[PDB]
Amino acid sequence: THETNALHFMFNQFSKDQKDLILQGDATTGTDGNLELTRVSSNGSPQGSSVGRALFYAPVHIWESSAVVASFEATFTFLIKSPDSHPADGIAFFISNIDSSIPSGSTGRLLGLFPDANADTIVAVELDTYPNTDIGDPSYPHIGIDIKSVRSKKTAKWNMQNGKVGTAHIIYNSVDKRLSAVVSYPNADSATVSYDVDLDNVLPEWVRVGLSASTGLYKETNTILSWSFTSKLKSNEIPDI
Amino acid sequence: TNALHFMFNQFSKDQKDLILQGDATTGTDGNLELTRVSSNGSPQGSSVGRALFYAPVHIWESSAVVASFEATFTFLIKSPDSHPADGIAFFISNIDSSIPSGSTGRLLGLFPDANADTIVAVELDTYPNTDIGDPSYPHIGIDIKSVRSKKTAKWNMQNGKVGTAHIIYNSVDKRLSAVVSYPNADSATVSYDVDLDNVLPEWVRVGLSASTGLYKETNTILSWSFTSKLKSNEIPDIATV
Amino acid sequence: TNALHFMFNQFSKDQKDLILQGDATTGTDGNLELTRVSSNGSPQGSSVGRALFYAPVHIWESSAVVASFEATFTFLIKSPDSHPADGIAFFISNIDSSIPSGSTGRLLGLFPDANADTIVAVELDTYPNTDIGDPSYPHIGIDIKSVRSKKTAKWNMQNGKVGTAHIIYNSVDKRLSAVVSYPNADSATVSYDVDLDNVLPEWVRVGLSASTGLYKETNTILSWSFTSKLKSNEIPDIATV
Amino acid sequence: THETNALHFMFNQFSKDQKDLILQGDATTGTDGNLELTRVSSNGSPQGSSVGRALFYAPVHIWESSAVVASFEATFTFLIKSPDSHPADGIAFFISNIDSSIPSGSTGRLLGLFPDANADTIVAVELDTYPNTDIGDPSYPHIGIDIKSVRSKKTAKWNMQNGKVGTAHIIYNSVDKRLSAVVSYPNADSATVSYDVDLDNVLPEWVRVGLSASTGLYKETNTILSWSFTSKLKSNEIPDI
Ligand SMILES: [Ca+2]
Ligand SMILES: [Ca+2]
Ligand SMILES: [Ca+2]
Ligand SMILES: [Ca+2]
Ligand SMILES: [Ca+2]
Ligand SMILES: [Ca+2]
Ligand SMILES: [Ca+2]
Ligand SMILES: [Ca+2]
Ligand SMILES: [Mn+2]
Ligand SMILES: [Mn+2]
Ligand SMILES: [Mn+2]
Ligand SMILES: [Mn+2]
Ligand SMILES: [Zn+2]
Ligand SMILES: [Zn+2]
Ligand SMILES: [Zn+2]
Ligand SMILES: [Zn+2]
């Protein structure tokens, strides 16, 4: 039908002066047509104590006073390399208040999203490369759903492939009120995580969507090779079933 | 992930991708008339017609790979008196399903009696027949191998207005939902827990059915779209809207 | 292949993904009123308004990588007399473009005079002004850096009916096309050979503009969608419909 | 908008008894979830003098008496292996009259599509593995647009990769009246070919879409790993610009 508001963007390539991206922290574009979320040295080696994010310029309308909530899909391809086989801390796809910025000291385990481990409102999927078991991480690389806290509401084990290009697929289904992620490498296993959450209880009506990454003492390239996003809001739709 | 999607926003005479049974015709004002109408727009009694999409739908493969699906249609039910009958149904059947003998009126072109082919239907039931187990108002109903609905919702049907019907089958949570709506009115919604891979064969046809009996109405379809995704039941459904 | 797509089928007050300039407002009956209307639905003279999508559009990258694009909008132009003015335009500008001084009436909110910002527009011109080079009937026109159209087609505009406008830029063949249509009427169509990567900057905003002067009309937008694909000019465009 | 007829199918996997595919000649499904268009021996070696095709079951509506023509996209992934480095004869995506069958003696250079080299109406894109310069092939592997004749209207050189999975992307744009193909391997060059042709001059109003392959004296696996098709027809659209 014809009763739907929608936003779609796709980057298969990033250049210098990517005017439709807001870059925060150490994030740069247009090195080999990639988005580097964390600082990489002149020789290609990642740096510690780094944090960076890229947000799409247009705000996204995610719910309305009718309790009608947008459905959305995000897809990105990433390259995490750690030459020392000591990677940290990971990549996140997030949804935030529109004027959200990098919280003070959100390097390392806090992934550029949270100021502490329990100002800004965050819903994220984490690709978490480093287990911090003292803040509820399982004791392995994992994907997680983060609702207003780095202490994931749900996690699944993630067999991350040092130096391989992987794909993350984020799905919000507003019929089911379910946030899900699938992370995969070619000719390898997929990891998946789901969590039931109505975003009209959690986020503002208007948000920005972004990618965030951090390093700490340990470090990794947090390289994004492509990023696509689609959001659909049908204002005259039944808000729940 | 195997997929089928079709969309009719216009019908023509000789619609080669539809199987028309009974009194069904396509092309009059670009519409599908499931039941007999006179040249003047007068609907006839004792009429039954169905339209099936020509292509069979792969509705399950294994315990891991099953099909989520969605159907939408827009309809115009009109009678010259206060007493329209008998209604419109969206159905999934065995691929070689035909109209059962005497299935006019209350049996909606789907069932030989009120308790052969395997039928799962969502019924837009305009006429309450209390002796075959209808509630005593017009209703939307989920029918699993029987005209006696497993679950119904009251339907405030508007004689002579264009309505929208939206059917959702979630193969992960095992839930069949229907929403029916007119402009500026609250929707009717019904949901029922049913694993369709235990009821239906591997291959199905999907269709629209409609009937009149003693009482009569136009059973005019203005549009009909359908999407089926045969996929892992470990991965979450992407919403359509 | 970088892509942007948006679709408005409904506008709200505080549409954060639109930049409103001049007299433009959003939300009255879920519509975008580009020019001033009274509470009773009476359009005012000497009015000008534009809506720009918040996100900038990457319209070329290199001699190999350039953007094909498509825009559709639906509009209601209504006056109480036989004499509506001055019309609606779809435009591409430099990203920080604002309404030029005195651009009401015949200049359509796009141009300071009839021969600053870089403007490329498709004009739905409701009022023939022969001294700034309009033909002597209502027309659709392609405007490249000038209100004096490079090419026009006669437009049989229907006061008080909902029209559809469809703009296509083919970056391979270097051709800017517009089609305007009402239900049950023949379309008006105009095409013009122009390499937009020689006229426009690398980054643009896209927008709708409208004006009234001495004579007046409603400049109501009911929907607006846009797709831009920045891709190799060795590969063929995929049509939208 | 809401004025479009559409058909979409996607196969990422083929099983035995693929009821929505018509198989012709030597074509089989459900060996390693693949479609084998030509005969492969029990040990995995391709056979000579083989021809086979797979057609989608639902007919596709490609034009109307208004001269409105469908736009369409087809994508497939294929594996051509010849252990002897002597491959023939190739794969084609085609569009035919609905009841089209394999012409007598269409093995080898005739690709399962034509009865001779100058009953059925064919438009095809060929992935031609074997140069027959006496019927106008260039003297290398090439992609070709075939309008009612194996003597390609347009060809481009194709650097085919023995034993690699490749992707073919077929585009018909009805705005441009242009049939195009792109053929690619991962981390390798793309080959592209285009030809201007209005299909309402060439095909029936209703068609089937298919894949065809042949071997001759020389042979290759003609393995299809995935196949997707989308066709859109907007009946109230301007038929040409
Ligand atoms: Ca961690
Ligand atoms: Ca099976
Ligand atoms: Ca009944
Ligand atoms: Ca719905
Ligand atoms: Ca540039
Ligand atoms: Ca004028
Ligand atoms: Ca159009
Ligand atoms: Ca050949
Ligand atoms: Mn974690
Ligand atoms: Mn009932
Ligand atoms: Mn003009
Ligand atoms: Mn050839
Ligand atoms: Zn809610
Ligand atoms: Zn089941
Ligand atoms: Zn150019
Ligand atoms: Zn034609």
PDB file of N, CA, C and O in Angstrom, chain A residues 1 4 71 73 169 171-176 178 180-182 192 194 232-234 237-238 240-241, chain B residues 7 72 74 164 166 168 170 172-173 175 177 179 187-189 191 234-241:
ATOM      1  N   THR A   1       0.882  -1.215   0.000  1.00  0.00           N
ATOM      2  CA  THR A   1       0.000   0.000   0.000  1.00  0.00           C
ATOM      3  C   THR A   1       0.902   1.242   0.000  1.00  0.00           C
ATOM      4  O   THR A   1       2.103   1.099  -0.260  1.00  0.00           O
ATOM      5  N   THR A   4       2.854   4.717   4.171  1.00  0.00           N
ATOM      6  CA  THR A   4       4.105   4.372   4.874  1.00  0.00           C
ATOM      7  C   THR A   4       5.097   5.530   4.711  1.00  0.00           C
ATOM      8  O   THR A   4       5.286   5.975   3.566  1.00  0.00           O
ATOM      9  N   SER A  71       9.303  -0.350  12.039  1.00  0.00           N
ATOM     10  CA  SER A  71      10.166  -1.553  11.855  1.00  0.00           C
ATOM     11  C   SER A  71      11.437  -1.060  11.196  1.00  0.00           C
ATOM     12  O   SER A  71      11.341  -0.044  10.494  1.00  0.00           O
ATOM     13  N   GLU A  73      15.653  -2.356   9.590  1.00  0.00           N
ATOM     14  CA  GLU A  73      16.734  -3.295   9.220  1.00  0.00           C
ATOM     15  C   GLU A  73      18.016  -2.447   9.145  1.00  0.00           C
ATOM     16  O   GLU A  73      17.963  -1.312   8.604  1.00  0.00           O
ATOM     17  N   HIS A 169      23.583  -8.148  10.676  1.00  0.00           N
ATOM     18  CA  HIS A 169      22.203  -7.847  10.208  1.00  0.00           C
ATOM     19  C   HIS A 169      21.320  -7.610  11.441  1.00  0.00           C
ATOM     20  O   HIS A 169      21.074  -8.592  12.190  1.00  0.00           O
ATOM     21  N   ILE A 171      17.689  -6.368  13.051  1.00  0.00           N
ATOM     22  CA  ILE A 171      16.253  -6.342  12.670  1.00  0.00           C
ATOM     23  C   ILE A 171      15.463  -5.837  13.863  1.00  0.00           C
ATOM     24  O   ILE A 171      15.530  -6.493  14.904  1.00  0.00           O
ATOM     25  N   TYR A 172      14.710  -4.753  13.707  1.00  0.00           N
ATOM     26  CA  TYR A 172      13.628  -4.422  14.661  1.00  0.00           C
ATOM     27  C   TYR A 172      12.270  -4.661  13.984  1.00  0.00           C
ATOM     28  O   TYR A 172      11.903  -3.940  13.010  1.00  0.00           O
ATOM     29  N   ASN A 173      11.511  -5.612  14.524  1.00  0.00           N
ATOM     30  CA  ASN A 173      10.140  -5.949  14.053  1.00  0.00           C
ATOM     31  C   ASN A 173       9.133  -5.355  15.055  1.00  0.00           C
ATOM     32  O   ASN A 173       9.091  -5.832  16.204  1.00  0.00           O
ATOM     33  N   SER A 174       8.365  -4.342  14.652  1.00  0.00           N
ATOM     34  CA  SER A 174       7.442  -3.607  15.554  1.00  0.00           C
ATOM     35  C   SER A 174       6.142  -4.398  15.736  1.00  0.00           C
ATOM     36  O   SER A 174       5.461  -4.177  16.706  1.00  0.00           O
ATOM     37  N   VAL A 175       5.827  -5.322  14.850  1.00  0.00           N
ATOM     38  CA  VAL A 175       4.668  -6.239  15.046  1.00  0.00           C
ATOM     39  C   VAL A 175       4.957  -7.125  16.265  1.00  0.00           C
ATOM     40  O   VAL A 175       4.077  -7.263  17.117  1.00  0.00           O
ATOM     41  N   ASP A 176       6.179  -7.653  16.365  1.00  0.00           N
ATOM     42  CA  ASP A 176       6.587  -8.584  17.443  1.00  0.00           C
ATOM     43  C   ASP A 176       7.173  -7.808  18.619  1.00  0.00           C
ATOM     44  O   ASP A 176       7.298  -8.437  19.672  1.00  0.00           O
ATOM     45  N   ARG A 178      10.346  -6.858  18.819  1.00  0.00           N
ATOM     46  CA  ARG A 178      11.536  -7.725  18.979  1.00  0.00           C
ATOM     47  C   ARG A 178      12.724  -7.115  18.228  1.00  0.00           C
ATOM     48  O   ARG A 178      12.587  -6.887  17.012  1.00  0.00           O
ATOM     49  N   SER A 180      16.595  -7.971  17.147  1.00  0.00           N
ATOM     50  CA  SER A 180      17.391  -9.182  16.826  1.00  0.00           C
ATOM     51  C   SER A 180      18.628  -8.773  16.044  1.00  0.00           C
ATOM     52  O   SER A 180      18.641  -7.687  15.435  1.00  0.00           O
ATOM     53  N   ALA A 181      19.649  -9.615  16.099  1.00  0.00           N
ATOM     54  CA  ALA A 181      20.890  -9.468  15.320  1.00  0.00           C
ATOM     55  C   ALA A 181      21.333 -10.849  14.842  1.00  0.00           C
ATOM     56  O   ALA A 181      21.122 -11.827  15.603  1.00  0.00           O
ATOM     57  N   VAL A 182      21.887 -10.913  13.621  1.00  0.00           N
ATOM     58  CA  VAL A 182      22.634 -12.081  13.080  1.00  0.00           C
ATOM     59  C   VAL A 182      24.015 -11.605  12.642  1.00  0.00           C
ATOM     60  O   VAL A 182      24.093 -10.632  11.892  1.00  0.00           O
ATOM     61  N   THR A 192      23.291 -15.510  16.554  1.00  0.00           N
ATOM     62  CA  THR A 192      22.014 -14.756  16.594  1.00  0.00           C
ATOM     63  C   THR A 192      21.580 -14.487  18.048  1.00  0.00           C
ATOM     64  O   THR A 192      21.822 -15.329  18.937  1.00  0.00           O
ATOM     65  N   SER A 194      18.153 -12.242  20.206  1.00  0.00           N
ATOM     66  CA  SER A 194      16.815 -11.591  20.167  1.00  0.00           C
ATOM     67  C   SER A 194      16.442 -11.077  21.558  1.00  0.00           C
ATOM     68  O   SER A 194      16.820 -11.698  22.580  1.00  0.00           O
ATOM     69  N   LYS A 232      10.779   1.873   8.303  1.00  0.00           N
ATOM     70  CA  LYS A 232       9.379   2.058   7.831  1.00  0.00           C
ATOM     71  C   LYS A 232       8.430   2.301   9.013  1.00  0.00           C
ATOM     72  O   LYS A 232       8.431   1.505   9.952  1.00  0.00           O
ATOM     73  N   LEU A 233       7.621   3.355   8.921  1.00  0.00           N
ATOM     74  CA  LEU A 233       6.592   3.756   9.916  1.00  0.00           C
ATOM     75  C   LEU A 233       5.229   3.894   9.206  1.00  0.00           C
ATOM     76  O   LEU A 233       5.086   4.794   8.348  1.00  0.00           O
ATOM     77  N   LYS A 234       4.261   3.019   9.483  1.00  0.00           N
ATOM     78  CA  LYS A 234       2.897   3.139   8.890  1.00  0.00           C
ATOM     79  C   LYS A 234       1.959   3.704   9.946  1.00  0.00           C
ATOM     80  O   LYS A 234       1.540   2.938  10.831  1.00  0.00           O
ATOM     81  N   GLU A 237      -1.445   2.294  10.800  1.00  0.00           N
ATOM     82  CA  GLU A 237      -1.396   0.830  11.092  1.00  0.00           C
ATOM     83  C   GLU A 237      -1.915   0.587  12.516  1.00  0.00           C
ATOM     84  O   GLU A 237      -1.773   1.482  13.380  1.00  0.00           O
ATOM     85  N   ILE A 238      -2.505  -0.583  12.766  1.00  0.00           N
ATOM     86  CA  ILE A 238      -2.806  -1.022  14.158  1.00  0.00           C
ATOM     87  C   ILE A 238      -1.466  -1.019  14.907  1.00  0.00           C
ATOM     88  O   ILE A 238      -0.473  -1.535  14.406  1.00  0.00           O
ATOM     89  N   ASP A 240      -0.401  -2.522  17.660  1.00  0.00           N
ATOM     90  CA  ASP A 240      -0.032  -3.819  18.295  1.00  0.00           C
ATOM     91  C   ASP A 240      -1.108  -4.844  17.912  1.00  0.00           C
ATOM     92  O   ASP A 240      -2.173  -4.409  17.467  1.00  0.00           O
ATOM     93  N   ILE A 241      -0.852  -6.148  18.045  1.00  0.00           N
ATOM     94  CA  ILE A 241      -1.832  -7.213  17.659  1.00  0.00           C
ATOM     95  C   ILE A 241      -2.270  -7.996  18.904  1.00  0.00           C
ATOM     96  O   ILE A 241      -1.681  -7.849  19.972  1.00  0.00           O
TER      97      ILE A 241
ATOM     98  N   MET B   7       1.759  -9.047  -6.116  1.00  0.00           N
ATOM     99  CA  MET B   7       0.901  -7.865  -5.887  1.00  0.00           C
ATOM    100  C   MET B   7       0.031  -7.628  -7.126  1.00  0.00           C
ATOM    101  O   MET B   7       0.578  -7.422  -8.225  1.00  0.00           O
ATOM    102  N   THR B  72      -2.276  -9.214   2.171  1.00  0.00           N
ATOM    103  CA  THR B  72      -3.097  -7.992   2.295  1.00  0.00           C
ATOM    104  C   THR B  72      -4.051  -8.019   1.117  1.00  0.00           C
ATOM    105  O   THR B  72      -3.612  -8.397   0.015  1.00  0.00           O
ATOM    106  N   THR B  74      -7.690  -5.524  -0.307  1.00  0.00           N
ATOM    107  CA  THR B  74      -8.703  -4.459  -0.153  1.00  0.00           C
ATOM    108  C   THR B  74      -9.946  -4.948  -0.894  1.00  0.00           C
ATOM    109  O   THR B  74      -9.797  -5.585  -1.972  1.00  0.00           O
ATOM    110  N   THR B 164      -9.607  -2.866   4.406  1.00  0.00           N
ATOM    111  CA  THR B 164      -8.290  -3.526   4.228  1.00  0.00           C
ATOM    112  C   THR B 164      -8.200  -4.708   5.184  1.00  0.00           C
ATOM    113  O   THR B 164      -8.642  -4.569   6.345  1.00  0.00           O
ATOM    114  N   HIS B 166      -5.312  -7.594   6.549  1.00  0.00           N
ATOM    115  CA  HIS B 166      -3.860  -7.900   6.664  1.00  0.00           C
ATOM    116  C   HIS B 166      -3.725  -9.171   7.498  1.00  0.00           C
ATOM    117  O   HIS B 166      -4.146  -9.157   8.664  1.00  0.00           O
ATOM    118  N   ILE B 168      -1.054 -12.156   8.949  1.00  0.00           N
ATOM    119  CA  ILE B 168       0.366 -12.427   9.312  1.00  0.00           C
ATOM    120  C   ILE B 168       0.434 -13.843   9.897  1.00  0.00           C
ATOM    121  O   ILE B 168      -0.282 -14.102  10.872  1.00  0.00           O
ATOM    122  N   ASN B 170       3.449 -15.917  11.642  1.00  0.00           N
ATOM    123  CA  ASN B 170       4.781 -16.015  12.299  1.00  0.00           C
ATOM    124  C   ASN B 170       5.109 -17.494  12.563  1.00  0.00           C
ATOM    125  O   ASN B 170       4.564 -18.076  13.514  1.00  0.00           O
ATOM    126  N   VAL B 172       7.963 -18.732  13.620  1.00  0.00           N
ATOM    127  CA  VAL B 172       8.891 -18.846  14.779  1.00  0.00           C
ATOM    128  C   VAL B 172       8.064 -19.007  16.052  1.00  0.00           C
ATOM    129  O   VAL B 172       8.229 -20.023  16.720  1.00  0.00           O
ATOM    130  N   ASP B 173       7.174 -18.051  16.325  1.00  0.00           N
ATOM    131  CA  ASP B 173       6.309 -18.051  17.533  1.00  0.00           C
ATOM    132  C   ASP B 173       5.050 -18.895  17.290  1.00  0.00           C
ATOM    133  O   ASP B 173       4.333 -19.133  18.273  1.00  0.00           O
ATOM    134  N   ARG B 175       2.068 -18.324  15.291  1.00  0.00           N
ATOM    135  CA  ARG B 175       0.919 -17.431  15.591  1.00  0.00           C
ATOM    136  C   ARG B 175       0.335 -16.907  14.276  1.00  0.00           C
ATOM    137  O   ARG B 175       1.100 -16.380  13.467  1.00  0.00           O
ATOM    138  N   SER B 177      -2.340 -14.287  12.805  1.00  0.00           N
ATOM    139  CA  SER B 177      -2.992 -13.001  13.126  1.00  0.00           C
ATOM    140  C   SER B 177      -3.688 -12.468  11.875  1.00  0.00           C
ATOM    141  O   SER B 177      -3.204 -12.722  10.754  1.00  0.00           O
ATOM    142  N   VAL B 179      -5.887  -8.658  10.864  1.00  0.00           N
ATOM    143  CA  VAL B 179      -6.338  -7.275  11.179  1.00  0.00           C
ATOM    144  C   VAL B 179      -7.222  -6.838  10.017  1.00  0.00           C
ATOM    145  O   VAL B 179      -6.757  -6.959   8.871  1.00  0.00           O
ATOM    146  N   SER B 187      -9.541  -0.840  14.097  1.00  0.00           N
ATOM    147  CA  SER B 187      -9.380  -2.179  13.473  1.00  0.00           C
ATOM    148  C   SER B 187     -10.020  -3.271  14.340  1.00  0.00           C
ATOM    149  O   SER B 187     -10.093  -3.113  15.561  1.00  0.00           O
ATOM    150  N   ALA B 188     -10.468  -4.358  13.720  1.00  0.00           N
ATOM    151  CA  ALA B 188     -10.693  -5.658  14.380  1.00  0.00           C
ATOM    152  C   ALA B 188      -9.416  -6.497  14.217  1.00  0.00           C
ATOM    153  O   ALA B 188      -8.835  -6.490  13.100  1.00  0.00           O
ATOM    154  N   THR B 189      -8.986  -7.187  15.274  1.00  0.00           N
ATOM    155  CA  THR B 189      -7.761  -8.028  15.299  1.00  0.00           C
ATOM    156  C   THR B 189      -8.034  -9.323  16.074  1.00  0.00           C
ATOM    157  O   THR B 189      -8.651  -9.256  17.153  1.00  0.00           O
ATOM    158  N   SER B 191      -5.843 -13.254  16.876  1.00  0.00           N
ATOM    159  CA  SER B 191      -4.567 -14.005  16.853  1.00  0.00           C
ATOM    160  C   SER B 191      -4.842 -15.395  17.395  1.00  0.00           C
ATOM    161  O   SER B 191      -5.659 -15.508  18.318  1.00  0.00           O
ATOM    162  N   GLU B 234      15.484 -20.323  13.377  1.00  0.00           N
ATOM    163  CA  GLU B 234      16.453 -19.716  14.323  1.00  0.00           C
ATOM    164  C   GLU B 234      16.599 -18.217  14.053  1.00  0.00           C
ATOM    165  O   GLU B 234      17.150 -17.527  14.951  1.00  0.00           O
ATOM    166  N   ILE B 235      16.215 -17.738  12.862  1.00  0.00           N
ATOM    167  CA  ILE B 235      16.382 -16.299  12.488  1.00  0.00           C
ATOM    168  C   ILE B 235      15.036 -15.583  12.575  1.00  0.00           C
ATOM    169  O   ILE B 235      13.974 -16.139  12.293  1.00  0.00           O
ATOM    170  N   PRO B 236      15.061 -14.297  12.976  1.00  0.00           N
ATOM    171  CA  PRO B 236      13.834 -13.534  13.177  1.00  0.00           C
ATOM    172  C   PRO B 236      13.256 -13.015  11.850  1.00  0.00           C
ATOM    173  O   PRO B 236      13.983 -12.784  10.882  1.00  0.00           O
ATOM    174  N   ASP B 237      11.935 -12.882  11.823  1.00  0.00           N
ATOM    175  CA  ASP B 237      11.196 -12.353  10.656  1.00  0.00           C
ATOM    176  C   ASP B 237      11.495 -10.859  10.537  1.00  0.00           C
ATOM    177  O   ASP B 237      11.529 -10.172  11.587  1.00  0.00           O
ATOM    178  N   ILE B 238      11.717 -10.403   9.305  1.00  0.00           N
ATOM    179  CA  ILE B 238      11.640  -8.971   8.904  1.00  0.00           C
ATOM    180  C   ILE B 238      10.164  -8.641   8.636  1.00  0.00           C
ATOM    181  O   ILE B 238       9.541  -9.326   7.785  1.00  0.00           O
ATOM    182  N   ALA B 239       9.622  -7.645   9.345  1.00  0.00           N
ATOM    183  CA  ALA B 239       8.291  -7.047   9.087  1.00  0.00           C
ATOM    184  C   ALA B 239       8.249  -6.551   7.633  1.00  0.00           C
ATOM    185  O   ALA B 239       9.335  -6.318   7.049  1.00  0.00           O
ATOM    186  N   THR B 240       7.055  -6.402   7.058  1.00  0.00           N
ATOM    187  CA  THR B 240       6.850  -5.872   5.681  1.00  0.00           C
ATOM    188  C   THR B 240       6.763  -4.340   5.723  1.00  0.00           C
ATOM    189  O   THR B 240       7.493  -3.671   4.966  1.00  0.00           O
ATOM    190  N   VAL B 241       5.906  -3.796   6.575  1.00  0.00           N
ATOM    191  CA  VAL B 241       5.716  -2.324   6.683  1.00  0.00           C
ATOM    192  C   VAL B 241       6.839  -1.743   7.552  1.00  0.00           C
ATOM    193  O   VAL B 241       6.905  -1.969   8.757  1.00  0.00           O
TER     194      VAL B 241
END
